[PDB]
Design a protein around this ligand. Sequence first.
Ligand SMILES: Cc1ccc(C(=O)Nc2cccc(C(F)(F)F)c2)cc1Nc1nc(-c2cccnc2)nc2c1cnn2C
Length: 267
Amino acid sequence: TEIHPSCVTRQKVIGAGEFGEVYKGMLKTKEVPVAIKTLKAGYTEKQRVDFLGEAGIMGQFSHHNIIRLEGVISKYKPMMIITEYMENGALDKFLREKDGEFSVLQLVGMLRGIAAGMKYLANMNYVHRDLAARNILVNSNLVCKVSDFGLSPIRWTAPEAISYRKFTSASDVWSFGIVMWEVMTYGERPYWELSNHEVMKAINDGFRLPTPMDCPSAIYQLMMQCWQQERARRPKFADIVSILDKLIRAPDSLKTLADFDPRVSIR
Ligand SMILES: Cc1ccc(C(=O)Nc2cccc(C(F)(F)F)c2)cc1Nc1nc(-c2cccnc2)nc2c1cnn2C
């Protein structure tokens, strides 16, 4: 959809872009709130291709858990990508600002949503490469929409994508496992203070993130299987969506928690 510049008003700056700013604003069709990514004058050929390519793929995406493209401005400068505005913003910040305020069923439902959007992207043969809670937006219905703000990560990346740039939907499944851990922990930093290199050496040496507090056994088992070293052994996003859907629809299944590895405090 081509949007006319007269239908768009920018208000706030809310981020930075490839060669532009990200704004909040209002779109006419009263006025829907929207987010606006601009491509400022002097952008390169390559930048133009990535910008309008991004706009095109977003326009072909149509799924509940994928950021919805309101429209594009391509015939006027600056060029713009206009999406629905997501009131609660990015999931990582959102969960960190709302620590403990959600039920396990709400959290697992946020994970089903993300995994559904990811299954859709993998099925459309789109490799995300930067799946993290910082790239997931949350609307006022707690509905998670996969997005990409393109500031690209090691900690969320599969070992083969690190080691030799093999980015696939199986590498996105690894990232999704990290996202599961981010969610169930209310936005804790994966591996905490380990450096990037220490994170790579811990993974390749077989360490995996431990269980979040208050995490259903089935949810930890699932993220653990997203972190298989052998990429062919990881669940497909269809497997993930399926398991999450069955857990949610039979919610007692989430009452069995995985053990939490503590630290001492004694009577
Ligand atoms: C304005 C905008 C422009 C682009 C995208 C986006 O996600 N594009 C994209 C690119 C590749 C792949 C995919 C995917 F497959 F994953 F879907 C999406 C999202 C937004 N919308 C927003 N951006 C930002 C934003 C914030 C900071 C930096 N960049 C962007 N904040 C927003 C919104 C909507 N609400 N809010 C709060």
